[PDB]
Amino acid sequence: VSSQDPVTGLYNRSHFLDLMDAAVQQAVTARKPSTLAYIHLNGYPSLQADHGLSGIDLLLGQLAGLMREQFGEEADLARFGDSIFAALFKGKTPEQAQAALQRLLKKVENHLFELNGRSAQATLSIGVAGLDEKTAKAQDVMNRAHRCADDAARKGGSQIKQ
């Protein structure tokens, strides 16, 4: 079965979750820190309402292309859900990864999207969680970055919550 999201071009959640499992094992046996970024597209409901399936398909594809650009080789990129992206920064502490997360955040906030003639703007809410040897369950890492991202999007605008 294909491991890629045909809309965005990024790998799928299933694929990412395997990469996740492996990065945690590395973190608790080899003690190599990784960072998990949990990315919300802010105001997705309103963008879908105004632009519909076609509009958002284009947005997500552009949004991913900016993530590929801003993170390059440093991160593994997934389409986690409809309005949710995920990034794993293998070998980097959250501290070490903040720079690139800050860079993307602004790239998006200051980016104008062309959607079927129409024009739109968007910000992201990023929940960040580290992978370390004090990790107890791979699922705990997902949870923390999840919860942080949800708290991030609860505030409105471009947001990073570590």
Other beta carbons within 10 angstroms of residue 142's beta carbon come to: 19
Residue 27 region by backbone torsions, left for phi larger than 0, else alpha for psi between -120 and 50, else beta:
alpha
The reported resolution of this PDB entry, expressed in Å, is 2.0
CA separation (Å) from 146 to 4, 30, 50, 77? 22, 25, 26, 16
CA-wise closest residue to 118 among 47, 40, 41, 42? 47
Number of domains comprising the chain: 1
Domain hosting residue 157, numbered range: 1-162
Other beta carbons within 10 angstroms of residue 107's beta carbon come to: 15
The CATH code of the domain that includes 75 is 3.30.70.270
CA gap 90, 116 in Å, rounded: 36
Method: X-ray
**Structure token pair of residue 4:** 């890629």
3-class secondary-structure state, position 111: coil
Q: Which long-range contacts (CB under 8 A, 24 or more apart) does 114-117 make?
A: 114/58, 115/51, 115/54, 115/55, 115/56, 115/58, 115/59, 116/51, 116/54, 116/55, 116/58
CA gap 161, 148 in Å, rounded: 6
